Amino acid sequence: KQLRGNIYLAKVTRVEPSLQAAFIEYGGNRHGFLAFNEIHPDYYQIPVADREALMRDDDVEEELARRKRRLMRKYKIQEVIRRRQIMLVQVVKEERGNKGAVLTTYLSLAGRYGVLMPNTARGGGISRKITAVTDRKRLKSVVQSLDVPQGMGLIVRTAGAKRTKAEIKRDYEYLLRLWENIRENTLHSIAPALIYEEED
């Protein structure tokens, strides 16, 4: 049983200020590892008017890179995360023997033609196999019209380059509903619970 891609509702078992990491009970054989920089600010224990002065930011992936680097300079994990806290976590790397799974709170949900990041203010854009100029200008126009919310991203994968006008809107819409489903499952779940299973 490979677990990569699965999403669990999970609980902080201990916070390790030397590693700037938290260890996570998510239902597996060993605790998962969650580096501080993989922890979405929604999970910070900070006043609501700090978490806002911070969502609005104080290869355009650098703007997001600088963003995370801002947080890591500004807080230490033990200032903002505590034992027993609950979070949604996704498996990034499989548990290998005695070593527990590597986790993130920056989720991604992969559809046929694209990947939704319901957690990453990244706006939506195109795979690095972005090559043939025609598709890339066309697709940028396509992902442009999607009106990707707020603090989400959508990345068009290569399966979508040679893809329908609206085969991509459908696929995107399916992922938005699946994100809704996930958030709804979490309100009816406790502690460690599998919330979404990486389908294929």
Residue numbers in the entry: 36 to 93, 129 to 270
Extract from the study:
Furthermore, we have determined the crystal structure of a fragment of the C. crescentus RNase E catalytic domain encompassing the helicase-binding region, and show that a significant portion of the S1 insertion adopts an α-helical structure despite being predicted to be natively unstructured. The CcNTD1–575 construct was crystallized and x-ray diffraction data were collected to 2.1 Å resolution. The crystal unit cell was too small to accommodate a complete CcNTD1–575 protomer, suggesting that the protein had been proteolytically degraded prior to crystallization, leaving only a fragment of the full length CcNTD1–575 in the crystal. The final model encompasses residues 35–270 of CcNTD, which corresponds to the proteolytic fragment capable of interacting with RhlB that we had observed in the previous sections (CcNTD1–274). Residues 95–124 in this region could not be modelled, most likely due to conformational flexibility in agreement with predictions by PONDR and ANCHOR. Curiously, RhlB co-purified with the CcNTD1–274 fragment, indicating that the S1 and 5′-sensor domains of RNase E harbours the RhlB interaction site. The portions of the S1 insert that could be modelled are on the surface of the tetramer and are solvent exposed. Nonetheless, it is noteworthy that a helix from the S1 insert protrudes directly into the predicted RNA binding site of tetrameric CcNTD. From the crystal structure of CcNTD1–274 presented here it appears that the partially helical S1 insert occupies the area where RNA is bound in the E. coli RNase E structure. Negatively charged side-chains (specifically Asp 129, Glu 131 and Glu 132) could potentially mimic the negatively charged RNA substrate.
